[PDB]
Design a protein around this ligand. Structure first.
Ligand code: NI
Length: 341
């Protein structure tokens, strides 16, 4: 049965609620982005209207084979009427096609559902600025002060410098990058660009990337592993066993692997700086874990919410335990007292 935090009061609407069957009294199902915990339950046998971004709509059709007639893409930053209710989709700064949704209820209330997001000061100059928000459905993934990580720009700098140094010292080194969903494409694209290579990958991952409206994508990626010196592999294979096996497959073309695992947060972040990060090494293989996040840090989340000044906050992440719930409510109260709303 669908939880309260996926229901939008005063509407026939749900958000990211596809694993509950036919929800009683839902006329439109919104989908914030193409991640499996969020789309869980959609399939080619869905016959209700799905509202989403253009990019999410490419993935639903091409990867899940949802039929076209049920796919309702909307432009961003544009006032749209759905089943008689004004809505706006905003860029969520998460993965490609990820949105936040503003609902303007018939009774005068305004609600923002963040989906998954990485808060940024640029959001303070979208259509959010223009009016007041009564209720906030917030991505609280990293809602605790210990969660610090660097900017995406600093992390990509580190990865580009690291890769270019290694391959310039050894032209026979291969760079491998792990992936398990869409998101974080800048990691492997930035490294390939500095090396003047295309990125090689499976046909299934190549297909996925073709749905994302990345400009000039044909100039950047390929299914020919031989012609490429940056390879993508499933995240599960990013370990000494899995990478040894892959090196076997390259026909003596390479004698060293340098690999990147973009993780979320990892406790090494509490004591160490990005400049200081070191790999795990075994023989001719080195693995770097790099904290490339597509969710808000604690400080970014706080700044966003203090700016928005919502009347009520409903967390959508870490809600399963009383201790988590109570911890989050404490921080929301500090924020409101510190800022004065
Ligand atoms: Ni997500």
């Amino acid at each position: 049965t669908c939880p309260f935090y996926k229901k939008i009061p005063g509407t026939g609407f749900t958000v990211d609620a596809f694993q509950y069957g036919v929800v009683e009294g839902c006329t439109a199902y919104f989908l914030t982005h193409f991640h499996s915990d969020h789309y869980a339950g959609l399939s080619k046998h869905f016959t209700f209207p799905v509202y989403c971004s253009e990019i999410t709509g490419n993935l639903l059709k091409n990867k899940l084979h949802v039929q076209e007639q049920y796919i309702h893409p909307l432009p961003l930053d544009t006032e749209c009427i759905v089943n008689g209710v004004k809505v706006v989709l905003l860029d969520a700064n998460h993965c490609p096609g990820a949105v936040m949704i503003l609902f303007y209820l018939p009774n005068g209330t305004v609600i923002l559902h963040t989906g998954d997001f990485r808060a940024d000061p640029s959001m303070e100059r979208s259509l959010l600025a223009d009016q007041k928000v009564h209720m906030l459905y917030l991505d609280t993934t990293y809602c605790s002060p210990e969660y610090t990580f660097p900017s995406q720009q600093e992390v990509i700098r580190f990865a580009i410098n690291t890769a270019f140094e290694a391959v310039t010292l050894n032209p026979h080194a291969l760079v491998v990058c792990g992936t398990y969903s869409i998101g974080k494409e800048k990691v492997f694209l930035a490294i390939a660009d500095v090396l003047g290579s295309k990125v090689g990958m499976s046909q299934e991952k190549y297909k996925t990337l073709q749905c994302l409206n990345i400009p000039e994508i044909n100039s950047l990626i390929t299914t020919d592993m031989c012609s490429s010196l940056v390879h993508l592999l499933p995240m599960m294979q990013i370990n000494f066993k899995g990478l040894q096996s892959h090196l076997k497959k390259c026909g003596g073309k390479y004698n060293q692997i340098l690999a990147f695992r973009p993780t979320g947060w990892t406790h090494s972040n509490k004591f160490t700086r990005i400049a200081d990060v070191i790999p795990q090494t075994k023989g001719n293989i080195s693995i770097y874990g790099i904290p490339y996040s597509e969710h808000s840090s604690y400080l970014e989340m706080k700044r966003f919410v203090q700016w928005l000044k919502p009347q009520k906050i409903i967390p959508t992440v870490n809600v399963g335990t009383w201790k988590s719930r109570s911890t989050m409510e404490k921080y929301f109260r500090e924020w409101k007292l510190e800022a004065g709303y």
